[PDB]
Amino acid sequence: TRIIKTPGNNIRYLHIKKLGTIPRCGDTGVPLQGIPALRPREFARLSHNKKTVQRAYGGCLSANAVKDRIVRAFLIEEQKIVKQKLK
Amino acid sequence: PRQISDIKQFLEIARRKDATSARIKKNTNKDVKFKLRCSKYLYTLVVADAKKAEKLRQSLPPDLTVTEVG
Amino acid sequence: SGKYVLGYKSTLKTLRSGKAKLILIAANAPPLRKSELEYYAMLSRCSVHHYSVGVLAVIDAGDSDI
Amino acid sequence: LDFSSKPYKNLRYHSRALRDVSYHPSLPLFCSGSDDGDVQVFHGRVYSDLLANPLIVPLKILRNHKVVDNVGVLSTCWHPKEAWLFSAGAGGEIRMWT
Amino acid sequence: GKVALITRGRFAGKKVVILQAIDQGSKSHPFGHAVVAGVERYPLKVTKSMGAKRIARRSRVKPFIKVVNYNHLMPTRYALELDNLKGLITADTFKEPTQRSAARKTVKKTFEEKYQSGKSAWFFTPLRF
RNA sequence: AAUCCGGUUAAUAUUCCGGAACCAGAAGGUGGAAUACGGCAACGUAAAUGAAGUUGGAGACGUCGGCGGGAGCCCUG
Questions:
Q1: Best E2, E71, E76 residue to mutate vs chain C (most C CBs within 10 Å)
Q2: Name one GO cellular component term (chain A).
Q3: In Å, what is the CA distance from B63 to each residue of B66, E17, E18?
Q4: How many CA atoms lie within 13 A of A36 on its CB side?
Q5: Could you tell me which residues are beta bridge partners of residue E71?
Q6: Taking CB atoms and an 8 Å limit, are A71 and C36 in contact across chains?
Q7: Element at A78 (helix H, strand E)
Q8: Measured at the alpha carbon of residue D57, what is the angle toward residues D52 and D62, in degrees to the nearest 5?
């Protein structure tokens, strides 16, 4: 409850909506950046651009995790290619 | 309540049927506030120039309900 | 003599540009950093000490015993 | 500025990127130069009346300009006195459309 | 001509070829920049059962010419060079979007010819992640 | 998921009145773009295809102590 002063000079206790929690990254678990921090229902009206980043896997994982995943995939591909050539 | 600072847009808003009535309130600062109530928002335009306000009142659509200061 | 660029950005800047002549990646360094250094070393025939300063990226040797 | 923040009208005459647009300081005309080599000339009358919206219509479409490296009209200048357009191309040629 | 991959920005995980290197530094990019043209939309797996218009639509590829830093890029062992890919990369094309658009159109046409000829298959095929 | 003010009774108010908004859902209509974008970057825009299948976040989280920010009450010119 939040106490406020009415224009009629009356003290009114008004309900306070719970602060929205920003979405968390899928891999790291840290909250995502560049998106509003509101309730799940409130964020629905936002557009796709306002809800997802302009990057691969944007809106589900952090950019640092994305770079790490890209690097890990490249290293795995190189190792698999070398292993295939050796075999 | 969405204040509008574009005179042409207000005239266009009055041109469309979305407008219901327009109230011209005379403030203490001698500024004419042309408040037009639409279906989804209240359009208020404050014009300090009396001649501009007089021109706006004269150029208002006939269908619009012009209201004096309440 | 062979000033080290040990760290995260300095080591990567020296290694990627080829400035780091000798690299001593310790066990505490990230495996991705070691793998990227291995990829960089393979592309330029660099010296990888690979020590068992997270990654000692020496720009040169000079008086170094290596 | 008195109509809306959004543009009052839009045009896509140029087949290439619209390089620049110029409005004559005195003559009620505007010119637009683009890398397509075609320059569009429009005549626009603006009235101070609230109910009189700006009436802008195209007047001419300049053509026959050389295009080099996908670049045509680069700089367009209007005469300070008459409705004369000075357009400089990528080849160093300046056309004065009087 | 060296094949490179972009691990940053919107064009993440996209293979590019260095048409003109700006690693020496520039006022616009005070770093090891590199203006390269890559492929964003890899051509689809065209089937002989599909129609000629269907085959071309699937085989259509969307190129992308951009300048990125050396750190943002990743060198690769493979490399592809084209006659039309040399000398067409310059600051004027970057400065003039119409020149850039023609550069993108020409690069896509060259890539489409490369895809049609069956060359640069690894580059033409999008990389998984 | 989504509403406040002022006024109104013998006994009623976030319900009634006057004024001003918000939510959800629904179709078609208009206009805009459409046949997505720039920055090394975090990120940003009026729009900016996505089946099956796969994944994640929020919802949805233990307790205590001190500090900072604000509000109100009280105090005071």
A1: E71
A2: preribosome
A3: 9, 65, 66
A4: 16
A5: none
A6: yes
A7: helix A63-86
A8: 155
Write out the residue range of the structural domain in which residue E107 sits.
1-129
**Structure resolution, Å:** 3.4
Give the technique used to solve this structure.
Answer: cryo-EM
In order, the DSSP letters of C2-59 are --B--SSHHHHHHHHTT--SEEEE-TTS-HHHHHHHHHHHHHHT-EE------EEEES
Residue E16, helix vs strand vs coil: strand
Domain ranges of chain B: 1-70
C-alpha to C-alpha distance for C49 and C6, rounded to whole angstroms? 14
Contact E128 A56 (CB under 8 A): no
What residues of chain E lie within 8 A of the CB of C16, using their CB?
A: 70-71
DSSP D71: B
Q: Select from C12, C13, C43 the Cβ nearest to the Cβ of E75.
A: C43
Q: Directed axis angle between helix B7-15 and helix B50-59, to 10°? A: 20
Q: Which residues of A touch E13 (CB under 8 A)?
A: 56, 70
Q: Which residue has the tokens 């051509």?
A: E43
Q: H-helix or E-strand containing D40?
A: strand D39-45
**Distance F27 C1' – D37 CA (angstroms):** 47
